């Protein structure tokens, strides 16, 4: 059904529907499909879904000139631990990704692979099954008591990364990025947000290291910036974006309660702008908003009201994608896209609205999403959400 009580506003007259160049791509509008884990990849081997994924992405690519960022995609076995999330390190994975990107490109839209590593958010027993470490910044701190107990029970305690482990992660990012581009992707997004591995190095709650990868702002940023530099060099800065969540508390990150947190993210952005002024500007920075500190909470819950991402605009001078509870708040979008280099990511309501862009353009009702099929191995709740005209036929109006 449609979302009850939602009063839609047409956004056709705004910068949301002005073209913009992002890296090598030419967008027709600024409504972005952000990375959304859906768990339809098959086991063993973390292989993209051969039946439904190309259809799902093709559906959401249907407006020409749409930017699509894929679900988090593991860069290597050691970076993973979720059986039904895809990877892009292997030939078998690449083979299906080719079909998925083909479906997106057939719509004259664009595909960016989000490159993912889990760190302490992984499942230590699943890793142990595969002979893999349970990786983190500092084994002195665990993400929560459940995982700590699981780690003990699996005889796979947290492993503080060594410098050599970090070098291997960088090699994995490079390999996964080369595979992404060879498979046909228009670019990659480095996931350094939402409490996964890179974010764990950025955050002073998870990172208690005293080597060159922790203990200062500069040190905590080093791993993320080494990944950024490795990908700039191998696939070009215009094929690389970076995702950050300054105010996130998901997966036990500090968020705004850490008064040093904006200096940490300011440093990262300044380092990116320094690179840009030297001729190597990333295609974009993707920020999760304090509107959503935790995406497991329903829209309107978990909103941090004591800080904003405004600081980023004074530092970084390229495109910024903003995500978090924007679908239900066109009035907020209307104000924020007045800035001419701002794009808007719509997550949960892109799940439920394959024709979201049209609905935004025309001010139409939105399909309610069904959380119970976010992660199920089904076409149901994946490819069977109706377009507006289809919903009207089913009587949803
Ligand atoms: C089911 C689900 C899966 C998600 N998967 C990813 C992911 O793989 N990588 C990522 O960076 N963010 C992921 N997110 C976070 C979203 O990209 C987005 O930041 C968040 O949902 C807030 O935007 P929204 O209110 O428009 O949904 C996911 C969110 C949901 C609800
Ligand atoms: N916010 C995220 O990065 C994320 C990733 C996978 C599942 N849920 C949330």
Swiss-Prot record:
Coiled coil: none annotated. Signal peptide: none annotated. Belongs to the NADH:flavin oxidoreductase/NADH oxidase family. One of its GO terms (biological process) is apoptotic process. InterPro entries: Aldolase_TIM, OxRdtase_FMN_N, Oye-like. It comes from Saccharomyces cerevisiae (strain ATCC 204508 / S288c) (Baker's yeast). The lineage of its organism: Eukaryota, Fungi, Dikarya, Ascomycota, Saccharomycotina. The keyword Ligase does not apply. It holds the Pfam family Oxidored_FMN. The gene is OYE3. The active site is at 196 (proton donor). This is NADPH dehydrogenase 3. Substrate binds at residues 191, 194, 375. Flavin-dependent enoate reductase that catalyzes the chemo- and stereoslective hydrogenation of electron-poor alkenes. The enzyme is reduced by NADPH, and oxygen, quinones, and alpha,beta-unsaturated aldehydes and ketones can act as electron acceptors to complete catalytic turnover. The physiological oxidant remains elusive. Has a prooxidant activity, increasing reactive oxygen species (ROS) levels when overexpressed. Formation of OYE2-OYE3 heterodimers contribute to the induction of programmed cell death upon oxidative stress. Its cofactor is FMN.
